[PDB]
Design goal:
part of a larger assembly; 7 chains; A mainly alpha; B mainly alpha; C mainly alpha; D mainly alpha; B: mainly alpha; C: elongated; Syntaxin-1A (chain A); protein-containing complex binding (chain D); syntaxin binding (chain D); lipid binding (chain D); Vesicle-associated membrane protein 2 (chain D)
């Protein structure tokens, strides 16, 4: 009927549009989350290890009073 | 143009899939980590708690020692729809993992600080009894 | 196991010893023990689902900790108390948190002070319905966040402020906040897409102006006919500005009906939209 | 047909979901960024305590 | 070097000293030494994937660690043991974890107790197939999460509880959980999307009701067809409610077939839909 | 607790003791006492939002801490000073941070050194507008990240380097940086995703070459038509390369108008695209 | 402040004290002083980008640290040295890492051991190009991950193992891994959508079997028609199974050309598909 076929296209593109950008976000996302993933790999390291430094201190102090 | 739009946009609907599918792939790596990290922080939190304990003892010791084209175009939408549900799946796993960890960061920051003080006070009383 | 027994021993030990008990030293080591007792009690009071008891118990351990000089861990205890009263039945949920912040703040700990500060304004609003104090907190807290350069966080709070500012008739003071949070969110391409809603809210909030402002703000906004997201911002606004300047309470309430398809209206929008819809009639029958 | 003019919002709604998903994660970055300067700096002081506690061991033990 | 040698030395030292050997201070340094030994052994056992030996060894070190007087570190050791046994050959995976929570819970550490509590209920189902004991845990654990204001986690658990509650015929007890987790989900505009599935589950779960327990729950559900997310929720439901009120085990069994197109049915839905499918058949010619 | 008073007493004790004051032992703690004083001062300075003074106060406690032998907690103070001045109204934000990195660097803490290094290059640009030094920092910083295995962050900085390098005429040096960051991105099939935009930027950057540096860069780009991410990188480029090789400042200016639909053009792209739009006319009129 | 000077002093102090210089108490403190020396040296060698020197320096401070009795913080140094050598020009990168794992492994730290184990298998592949040794590491490492109930990471490694195992020749040993990683993937509804590609890979991998291992593996897969995720998995496979069972190498190569439209192919797929293309050609002219 033309009118519906043209109006159709109009709504389809307006749809196509909004889509492409939402995809743009994930791209930046995978780049952010990963950039943060490396910022935590060192944390886990500095943490469970700090437990060793403190554990060695609390131990020496105890054997320094008994 | 009429056909160059009913098909080109149709290719966009087909592409609309990989667009929302590549998003899942990007979401997986995120979730997979958010989960892996979630467990990590658990052993990480143990650090703030492990130190929280020892320091209390260490302080005491330092105190004791210190003193059909449209039919398909309609189907592709259904495809996007089925994937939209997925986007909700990750959106929730990502969400529930974010909120659960943010509050975890709070506890971590708290204890971490609380212990930092004990270290400073102890370091000011120990450094003097050096050598 | 027996909280009712622990509380008792708890008080029986929290007391500056004397006679032969004091000897030469006495205080810290004892009072701390009591703090641990009350914490142990408050815990089972939490599993017992008493809450009230748990909360007041944490208040006890907390207050006691101060008598030993340890504002830090003490304040964190007050946090436990607040969490108790919060998910409990009595009040005091607000007091505990005030006693927490008074400590974190003076201690130079604004990073965490803001953390509980927002929690505070959140309870003072969702429960106490004390918006006038809530805004004061959401704001000061946002200032702290903005100090740590924790942009996003500060914006979260600002959004709270403005959002609840338009509800309290403060429309102009709201648009200003949206302007600030809008100018400090453009340099980052991770907030571009979002700057829209800000302009939409700011354009909706009307201090009963009888002209542009909104027709000027919609202009300040950068949009392109091929824009996707922008369709969910000014595109609607323009049509609303025209239905307002022409005092037509038939074109406004219609366009909002259409927009309620491509982008559903949240409670906020609905409230303000209806307010504008009334201002139109209040200009027609006048 | 109508599905096209309809499904359009089926994503515009998600475009908002991610809008928050992108923000949520970023909000954690700063929370972990500061925690990275206070946690690592924390153990840094612990190092001073490890050295101090080690010496108190070679004198009183 | 070898674990078999370490276990031996550890045994010959894990003995409470008495008489002269005990002297003035028997000390827990011995029991602790043995703990370190067994830990060192259990680890290399975890190297040769002997698991069984690794786990039982950790149980040893942890058990002694209790005789040491340090419930905390011991508890986490029990966790290590659970981690071994879980992905191992023998069982005890359930024992160690129970022995861990009995420690975290009494110690006043619910935050972590719930963390392992969910792991527990997660194993007692996918393995022991003891739903009745799994749900009890998913629930009590959710109570802890809800106690720590951790709404998010709490809901993660509630979904499990109700999810498997409907499988155990507990339909009403399921819908109640869905109603609660549903109401405490709207206050957060970050769960709006998920709030659908909740209403779908709750409207599906039927405690042999014949009325509009669901026809009313579908109404309470604010929807507008061109929303989609919602189409994957009540649409089908409505068509199911008509097929039940007319004892038609053909319109319902066809609707499940068509709906299994736009949105695939998971094992849960399959099982329940079949139960509802039988409630129709046994009812027609009865 | 007067601020300026604390600033006075702090000075009263921050000095090598002598006479009867020195007594038997020195005063390695006196200097520390003073540090704590100035900190107490900067506290209330940050209270009244007088930041400036707070910052200048932290500079004092920090400088003093160095005169005590404690680079660690000292540098952290320099950071507090930087955060203060930064959020404050005066400058100094640059000095405190430089004085912070020299410490995090000499000590052995590059992770954090780079963490403040990027903040630095970011301020030396958005504020002082001193790109010639900002790039130097963005780069050295990326080097440190690239040595902490931290790949991503390294690239985060590299993008800044090349990004602002092409906006300074350094077009070639830019494409080279994009090549490096492009090669160190394929090793991770989890980055395959962003490795496009790099090719787009690199192909856009032109050092006024007469050959087909871009037609070659777009060729090196592995793309498949059905691909989606890729259609947002080279596809446009090819058309732009043809519009340039045909001195047609119309097809290029219209293709950039079309691509602006499917993919919004950020600030950068815009500026550069215009530079090419002028190279076409300039070649037409050369 | 000269590295070359420090490296000398360190040496002068790192040596089991002899004669009077020794006395009774050893040099447990001297060896530590030397470690600090070399550490300071490696540090300035890293700011100078002398990497090689930095790495070898850390190796010194580390080895000595072992001579002090502190495996923990030692291994940590070994890692620092590895990070140096990696982004450097000499070797030792592989040695430092093995020397680090022997420590994290015998110390009771498998979590971090596997963390560096995968790094190892990654370097031994992207550098040494030793696929057979890399697979061995990716495997032994996945065992540890899967033990730390980190199924997620475990599979991350398994995928590597099978992935490169199909590239070498091990097509069978590849499908087995895909089958295991496939069964242990359904227990998590967060991998359902991804569980497709697994079946696609496993069905593509052929160890020259004459039966219908693939026609059976594709049947084991659960698919319908109104699914679109599944469209990128078996639907194609069947077409390939028919093109193989009919010795028609143009229909196989035509279908790969079509499928390369709805779901663009990667390097892996390409290589294997061509392998299957040649098995067909080789069956035609025979």
């Amino acid at each position: 009927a033309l009118s519906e076929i043209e109006t159709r296209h109009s709504e389809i593109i307006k749809l196509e549009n909004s889509i492409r950008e939402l995809h743009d976000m994930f791209m930046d996302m995978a780049m952010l989350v990963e950039s943060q993933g490396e910022m935590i790999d060192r944390i886990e390291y500095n943490v469970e290890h700090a437990v060793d430094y403190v554990e060695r201190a609390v131990s020496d102090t105890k054997k320094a009073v008994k | 143009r009429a056909d160059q739009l009913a098909d080109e946009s149709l290719e966009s609907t087909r592409r609309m899939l990989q667009l929302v599918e590549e998003s899942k792939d990007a979401g997986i790596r995120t979730l997979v980590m958010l989960d892996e990290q979630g467990e990590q922080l658990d052993r990480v939190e143990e650090g703030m708690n492990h130190i929280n304990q020892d320091m209390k003892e260490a302080e005491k010791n330092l105190k004791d020692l210190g003193k059909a084209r449209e039919n398909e175009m309609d189907e592709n939408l259904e495809q996007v729809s089925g994937i939209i549900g997925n986007l909700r799946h990750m959106a929730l796993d990502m969400g529930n993992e974010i909120d659960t960890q943010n509050r975890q960061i709070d506890r971590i920051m708290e204890k971490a600080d609380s212990n930092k003080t004990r270290i400073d006070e102890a370091n000011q009383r120990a450094t003097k009894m050096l050598g | 196991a027996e909280a009712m027994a622990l509380l008792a021993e708890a008080e029986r030990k929290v007391k500056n010893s004397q006679s032969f008990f004091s000897g030469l030293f006495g205080g810290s080591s004892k009072i701390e023990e009591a703090c641990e007792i009350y914490a142990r009690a408050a815990n089972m009071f939490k599993m017992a689902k008493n809450w009230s008891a748990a909360g007041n118990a944490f208040c006890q351990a907390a207050q006691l900790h101060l008598q030993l000089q340890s504002k830090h861990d003490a304040a964190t205890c007050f946090v436990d108390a607040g969490n108790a009263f919060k998910k409990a039945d009595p009040q005091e949920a607000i007091n505990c948190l005030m006693r927490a912040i008074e400590i974190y703040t003076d201690m130079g700990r604004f990073t965490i002070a803001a953390k509980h500060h927002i929690s505070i304004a959140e309870i003072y609003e969702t429960e106490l319905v004390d918006v006038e104090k809530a805004i004061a907190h959401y704001e000061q807290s946002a200032d702290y966040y903005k100090g740590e350069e924790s942009n996003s966080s500060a914006n979260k709070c600002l959004l709270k402020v403005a959002g609840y500012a338009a509800q309290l008739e403060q429309y102009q003071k709201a648009i200003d906040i949206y302007e600030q949070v809008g100018t400090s969110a453009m340099d980052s391409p991770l907030l571009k897409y979002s700057a829209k809603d800000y302009f939409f809210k700011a354009a909706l909030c009307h201090f009963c102006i009888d002209m542009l402002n909104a027709k000027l703000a919609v202009q300040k906004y950068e949009e392109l006919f091929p824009a996707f997201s922008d369709s969910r911002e000014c595109k609607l606004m323009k049509k609303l500005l025209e239905a307002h300047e022409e005092q037509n309470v038939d074109s406004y309430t219609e366009s909002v009906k259409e927009y309620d398809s491509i982008s559903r209206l949240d409670q906020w929008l609905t409230t303000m939209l209806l307010r504008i819809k009334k201002t139109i009639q209040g200009d027609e029958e006048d | 047909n109508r599905r096209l003019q309809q499904t359009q919002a089926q994503v515009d709604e998600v475009v908002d979901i991610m809008r928050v998903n992108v923000d949520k994660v970023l909000e954690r970055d700063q929370k972990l960024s500061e925690l990275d300067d206070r946690a690592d700096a924390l153990q840094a002081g612990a190092s001073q305590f490890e050295t101090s506690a080690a010496k108190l061991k070679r004198k009183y033990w």
